Amino acid sequence: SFLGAQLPPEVAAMARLLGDLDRSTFRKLLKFVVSSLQGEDCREAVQRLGVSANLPEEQLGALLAGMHTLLQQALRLPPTSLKPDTFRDQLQELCIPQDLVGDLASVVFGSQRPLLDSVAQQQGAWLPHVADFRWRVDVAISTSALARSLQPSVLMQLKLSDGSAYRFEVPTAKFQELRYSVALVLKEMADLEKRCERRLQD
Amino acid sequence: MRFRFCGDLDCPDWVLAEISTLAKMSSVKLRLLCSQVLKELLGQGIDYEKILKLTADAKFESGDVKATVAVLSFILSSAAKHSVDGESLSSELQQLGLPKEHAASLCRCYEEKQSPLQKHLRVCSLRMNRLAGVGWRVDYTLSSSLLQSVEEPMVHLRLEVAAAPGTPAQPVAMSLSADKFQVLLAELKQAQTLMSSLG
Amino acid sequence: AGDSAILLRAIGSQIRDQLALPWVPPHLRTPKLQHLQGSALQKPFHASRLVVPELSSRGEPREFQASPLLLPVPTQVPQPVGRVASLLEHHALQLCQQTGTRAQRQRLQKQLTEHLRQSWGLLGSRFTHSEKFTFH
Amino acid sequence: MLLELSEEHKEHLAFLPQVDSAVVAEFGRIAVEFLRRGANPKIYEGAARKLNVSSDTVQHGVEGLTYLLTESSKLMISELDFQDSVFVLGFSEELNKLLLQLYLDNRKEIRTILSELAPSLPSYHNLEWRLDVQLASRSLRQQIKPAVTIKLHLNQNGDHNTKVLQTDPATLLHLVQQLEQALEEMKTNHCRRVVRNIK
Amino acid sequence: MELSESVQKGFQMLADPRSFDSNAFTLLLRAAFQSLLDAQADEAVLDHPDLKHIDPVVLKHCHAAAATYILEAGKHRADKSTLSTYLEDCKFDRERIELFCTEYQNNKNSLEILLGSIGRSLPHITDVSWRLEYQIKTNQLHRMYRPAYLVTLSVQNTDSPSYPEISFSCSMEQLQDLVGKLKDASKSLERATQL
Amino acid sequence: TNQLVDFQWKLGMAVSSDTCRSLKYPYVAVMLKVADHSGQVKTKCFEMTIPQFQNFYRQFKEIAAVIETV
Amino acid sequence: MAAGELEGGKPLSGLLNALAQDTFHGYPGITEELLRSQLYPEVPPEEFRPFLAKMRGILKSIASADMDFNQLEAFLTAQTKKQGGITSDQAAVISKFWKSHKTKIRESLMNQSRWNSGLRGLSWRVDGKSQSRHSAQIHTPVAIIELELGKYGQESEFLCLEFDEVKVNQILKTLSEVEESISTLISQPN
Incomplete structure (x- = not known):
């Protein structure tokens, strides 16, 4: 099962609560789960839904926790690996009512999915990225130590997505090492991609 | 399978593996090695020279030595953690396949140091901070530009606080009005009354 | 012990209810x-000094206290958590004060004065090389 | 695959056949000693006078030889590919066999040193935990508030850092669930193929 | 629970039928709770037209006494038996004892939620995320071929200057060690429920 | 450079400390409030002994004498 | 035999000196074994230990009281007139030591009890302002003052202030008010 070898306790709890729940309330809750996955703050809207449904907060918490887990584990699977027929079968082993299964399936496979995939791909980053890169190229004509220098250098400034920024000067012997290193890594990324496509894809 | 010295859990696979490395020593030098590790747990340092000198009996390589000291440290600490007696420890090490003579030796050393071990393990238990000391000065104020005559006491406190053993204490220094000082002392006495009801 | x-x-039945x-x-x-689950904000204990009416007040101090210029004591703080902390520390000081030698006190203040009198009564590179060699 | 010796790197190594293999064995000894401990230029002027060559001749030959061993260990080049790389140099079988042994004797230790150069990410060291129940505060006198106090120890650049943190019970059950799913991934057929095929 | 002589005299005046009738007692008592719990600092909270005959120095003194006792009773988790004992000591009659308990019971939960919101605490972990990578090469070392885990904890507290995420890396052995520690901690919560 | 916005002082006795039951020495404590560039205002405080005050006060009387005859 | 039995006054003066350096000046690393071996190498360590403790406890009491000669000699005399008490000659050595050290010890206790900043130095100069970039001609003088401050055992800060002839006199009168406050307090007993 896409839920792993042993059913998470929050999913088992939620699946027995669904028998008592009006489909109108289920579909209202499901929107909050999906929009929370896209990063939207929903806390006040959930509270209003609670008193509207007369759900105590102990049951809201169990329902919301169980729905989040089910969608998280399904949406992390590529379309090669979970497909509508096997998803629908596996959810029926949880004894989820068939009408609610259709609503869940529409979230995992319908037109909501591409925006969810975009948000899920953002979470692979762990180190910061280059946000900006600026330079100037200078030639030194004279200096305190030399009447004539005539030596080039590159002044560089990086801004990272961390919000950190660095300004530093690069000797041309050091720029050659940087340029070499970057082209080398690009060759070795391309070689690794060809290993993967010819051995891991089959 | 579950074991008391493991905390009512099945034995870790690295422990069950390295219990078979203990059987490779003589029972007479397995007992001597326990004494060296147990001294370190009691804070009395460790003698790597002696550990290496005796384990040459079995021709251990340094990976054997590392794994042997690690498993003895685990067994002794975890029995003491859960207050397991040497009678239980001997029986349940034998279930894991340690020879009965090696089991014996190992537990007659635990039996001797079980009580001082638990006192040390309580001292080592997680702390966020420790109050290392207190200093104070009381001043009397006579006059000011801001008030022609004052005539009020004032208190200065310096608190030494230690974040980790083997580190210099951080001083927290502050000044207080005599009203602020009175309320602080009275509040600490109420806290202490509650503390004394617990232990 | 019972x-x-x-x-x-x-304690144990609270941990059950949380587990x-x-x-x-x-976000839900x-x-x-x-x-x-710890996403609410607690507010620090911060106390402000209150003004309270005094029943024994007479004359011009009473004429102030009897008027809208002295606000009702808890409403003198805008925020309820600071309002609570203010009343708590105000009442704590009252207990310290009411729960707490004249010759000994006068003696000490005279001892301090003598020390003040006795204390006062003491009144009674190529750049630097170029500078050093050619511009110093 | 094979080593691409630069023309200057070849020209430095051309000193090796100019002297007896017993001296090249000494160059091998001092070469790996420098990798192990650090370089000491004071020996180069000694060997220079002993061999009737310049100190730069000794330095270039020895530092060239260290680089041969370092690049071979970096690549983990096979014995067959090593020979096909070295036979671009003209010298005789005795020196070719000496160099091959000097590589295979030391590649595993050199690779341990070369692993220290990688980009220095922060990493896990240890974790401590304590189960606390809060029973009273200055503002409210009877409570039960359970929390797990956590102390997380980390390495970066060889410097230890520590962070003191808190969880409630239900969050701690979430933390274990997620990081158990992390460990489960290495057992999935996808990651098994990577380990099996990307080697 | 101790109460200063200032607070006790304020209650002794609320106990009078002369100084306060049963109507004024109710209105001042309600104003006491309101001024504690309302977020509006209603400076006119005492301006009820039925309170206007009371001496404004006495009125504002008994109002602060009531509010101070309410906070002290709340903090010490006072039961009705404790409340009724202290009121009868102050010579309250059976009607006003009932009135005070009725207002206190209505507000008890709001007061206890307020008193419990005051404090500072450690940074609270709220979530975790992980990445699995296979390590291929370094500019100094080929054929590394070892997995690493990249772990981030999300902390959510502002009681002291802090940064919201803690990031660190684990080998297979380091992550297996870490998980064992958290399950050891979790096994101790289970034991504590057996108390 | 910096400019004084305000000057305040207090006179006190240090009476007792945990290490020394009878300190009983007087001090003068001064608070200086200074304005930085762009008018940022900050405070600095320091204690003086009574001999130190007498010197501090004595030297400002020298400044006032030279500043007239400059 | 014990160090308390010995009447080596210079060794005892050395012991008191070391005890004062450890206790009040706070010098680290002073320890019983060092003092025994240099001062009294013939005394067994176990016999030296109670004498060290006795001298330390007595000396701590003396410094906290800041004893005058009547207090010092009465207290030491009571220590002489007891079982295992010090000798009168030892007390005389202690008294001679305490006479000089009393000044130094007292000031050290002041520094230990202070954790606000203190005045470390005052320096000043007076300049004639003459011209600036824009003001082609200036003449009014100015005083520049550097104030050195620091906490005990910490690096000094320097604060630099600039004053015109008017602000110099405003500060000067403020200091005269401090002096006249003091003069009143010490005259009030008249």
């Missing part, structure tokens, strides 16, 4: 779950 047995039994509820994502937590 009193500590009652405490530990109360029995799943973790909920922070209603205010009850915000408290249990």
